Structures are given as C-alpha cells and as structure tokens.
Design a protein around this ligand. Structure first.
Ligand SMILES: [Cu+2]
Length: 120
C-alpha cells in the first residue's frame, strides 16, 4: 500500500511491533520525492505512542534529524538505516492491523497513513 501527498509518495510504511516487555517500536517506509523541489520529513504524530523521534541521518543513527528528500530521489527508512523511533507505547499493537500515523513534511504538509504492523 502507498500514500501520496504533493509530489511525495510514501510506499509501504511499516513497523515491527514491540517485543513483549518493550514499549518502543521502529517505523520504516520507502519515500519518493517525485518533484523538482526538495522537502523534509520533520515530524510524526501517532496517538498510540508518547512521542516519535525522527532519525533521518543514516550516517549517525543516534542523532535526532529530519529525513531530507532531495528532488527526484528515493529515500528508504529500513532496519539498520534511517528510521523513526516510536517511544512509550500506550496499548498493545495488534499484528495484522494498521497503526494510524500522521507524517508532517516541511513543504507538502501532513498526510495520514496506516503502517503495517509486523510480528516482533
Ligand atoms: Cu504496503
């Protein structure tokens, strides 16, 4: 599944459900900038988590930094690379359901998505 906003496409947003005992999750997606002007993923809003921290600099995965989206390029958020940390889960996440999230882009603005929840 995929979502479009402006000239951006967010393809198969997904995450691995927290392991039993853990309250944190890692959010992943394949983001395309199909436009001629740059953009940035600057925030993520999720009701089921206390906060969301964008780790968009693949060279330094401990830094809180937006995901830069240069024109005409595909940026992948994936395990072992850039990702969004979802911190302080409020209820248990059901594998097979979606996690409803709002992505906030600097120029293209907000888009409401459903992330596919995988087993731990
Ligand atoms: Cu999908």
């Amino acid at each position: 599944h995929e979502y479009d906003v402006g000239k951006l496409k967010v393809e198969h947003p997904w995450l691995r459900a927290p392991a039993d005992g853990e309250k944190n999750a890692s959010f992943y997606a394949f983001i395309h900038n199909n436009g001629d002007t740059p953009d940035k993923l600057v925030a993520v809003k999720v009701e089921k988590f206390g906060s969301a921290v964008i780790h968009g600099d693949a060279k330094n995965l401990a830094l809180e930094a937006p995901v830069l989206l240069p024109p005409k390029q595909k940026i992948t958020l994936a395990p072992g690379g850039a990702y969004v940390a979802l911190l302080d889960a409020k209820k248990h996440l059901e594998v097979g359901w979606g996690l409803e999230m709002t992505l906030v882009f600097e120029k293209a603005g907000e888009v409401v998505i459903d992330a596919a929840i995988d087993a731990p």
